[PDB]
C-alpha cells in the first residue's frame, strides 16, 4: 500500500464539511461568474474559458512543460477546454477533437473563442477503441473519478495504454495527458516503461483540488516518477487539517475570431 492509497482512505473517511474544506483548501481557482452565465444563456461569442481545463493547460504551457504545435489531437475533449486552448497557439495549425458525450458526459461548447474554425469537433467517438492517425501533439485530459482506487487505477492505465498507441502510431509526436491516479502499482509500471521509451515525467498544477490525485504527463519535462508521485502524496496527506480558503484568479479570455 502507498502513501497515495492511504490519502484515498483519509479522503473517504473525511465527514462531509471536513470534505468540502479540503477540497478546496489552498489551491488555484478561476473565476468564472461571467463565463458560466455567459455559457449557460447560450451565447456562442465569447473568449471565456469553457472549462477549468484551459486554465490548467494553459499553465501547463506557459511554463514551458508541454509545446503545442502542429496538428493536435484532443481525446476526450469534453466541453473542449483544451481544444480551444490548443487552437488560439500560433504555433497550433489544426486541432482534431474527439469526446463520447451521452447521458452523464459533456458535448463540446460550440463558441468562437480565437482559432475555433480549426478545430474539428467529433462528438459520440471512444477513444479507446479509435484507430490513431497522424498527429504532431497528442493530448488526452481523460480519467474519471471513483472513490474506489482501483477502479481509478484501471481507468488510469486504460488512457496510459491509449497514449502509448499514438506513439507507436507517432513516434515523434510530443504527449501531455492526465494520470488520475499516479500511486497505483499498475499505473506506476505502465509510466515507467512509457518513460524508458518516450522519456518524459509528471507535474501537478495548482489548479487541481486537493480532493483528486490527478498529475500531467508530459514528454517535454523530466524526473523520477516514484519520487514525483510520493512528493505529491505527501503535499496532499500535510493538507487534512488546513483551513485556507482558495485562492481565487481570473479566467482565461483567449479572445475570438478565425484563424
Ligand atoms: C462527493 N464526495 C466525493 N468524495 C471523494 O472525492 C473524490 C473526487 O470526487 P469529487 O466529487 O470531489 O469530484 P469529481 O471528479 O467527481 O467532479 P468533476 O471534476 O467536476 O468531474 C471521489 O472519488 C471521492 O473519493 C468524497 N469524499 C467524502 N468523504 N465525502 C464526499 O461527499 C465525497
Ligand atoms: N472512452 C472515451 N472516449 C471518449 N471520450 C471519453 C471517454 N471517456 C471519457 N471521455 C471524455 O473525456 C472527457 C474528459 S473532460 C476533459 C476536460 C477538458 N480537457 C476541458 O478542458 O474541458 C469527458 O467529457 C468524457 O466524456
Ligand atoms: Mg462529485
Not at 487505477?153 to 492526465?178: D, H, Y
Not at 491516479?181 to 501537478?204: D, T
Request: glycine share 10%; proline share 4%; aromatic share 8%.
Amino acid at each position: 500500500m502507498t502513501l497515495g492509497d492511504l490519502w484515498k482512505r483519509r479522503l473517504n473517511n473525511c465527514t462531509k464539511e471536513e470534505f468540502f474544506a479540503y477540497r478546496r483548501t489552498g489551491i488555484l481557482e478561476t473565476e468564472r461568474d461571467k463565463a458560466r452565465e455567459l455559457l449557460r444563456k447560450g451565447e456562442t461569442n465569447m473568449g471565456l474559458a469553457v472549462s477549468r481545463g484551459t486554465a490548467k493547460l494553459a499553465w501547463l504551457e506557459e511554463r514551458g512543460y508541454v509545446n503545442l504545435k502542429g496538428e493536435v489531437v484532443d481525446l476526450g475533449c469534453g466541453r473542449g477546454g483544451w481544444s480551444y486552448y490548443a487552437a488560439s497557439r500560433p504555433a497550433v495549425m489544426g486541432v482534431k477533437a474527439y469526446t463520447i458525450g451521452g447521458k452523464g458526459h459533456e458535448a463540446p461548447k460550440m463558441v468562437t473563442s480565437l482559432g475555433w474554425n480549426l478545430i474539428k469537433f467529433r462528438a459520440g467517438m471512444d477513444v479507446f477503441t479509435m484507430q490513431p492517425h497522424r498527429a504532431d501533439t497528442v493530448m488526452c485530459d481523460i480519467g474519471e473519478s471513483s472513490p474506489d482506487a482501483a477502479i481509478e487505477g484501471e481507468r488510469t492505465r486504460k488512457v496510459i495504454l491509449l497514449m502509448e498507441q499514438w506513439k507507436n502510431r507517432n513516434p515523434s509526436a510530443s504527449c501531455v495527458f492526465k494520470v488520475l491516479a499516479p500511486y497505483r502499482p499498475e499505473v506506476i509500471e505502465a509510466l515507467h516503461r512509457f518513460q524508458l521509451q518516450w522519456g518524459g515525467g509528471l507535474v501537478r498544477t495548482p489548479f487541481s483540488r486537493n480532493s483528486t490525485h490527478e498529475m500531467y504527463y508530459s514528454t517535454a519535462i523530466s524526473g523520477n516518477i516514484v519520487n514525483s508521485v510520493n512528493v505529491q502524496s505527501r503535499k496532499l496527506l500535510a493538507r487534512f487539517g488546513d483551513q485556507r480558503g482558495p485562492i481565487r484568479v481570473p479566467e482565461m479570455d483567449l479572445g475570438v475570431g478565425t484563424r
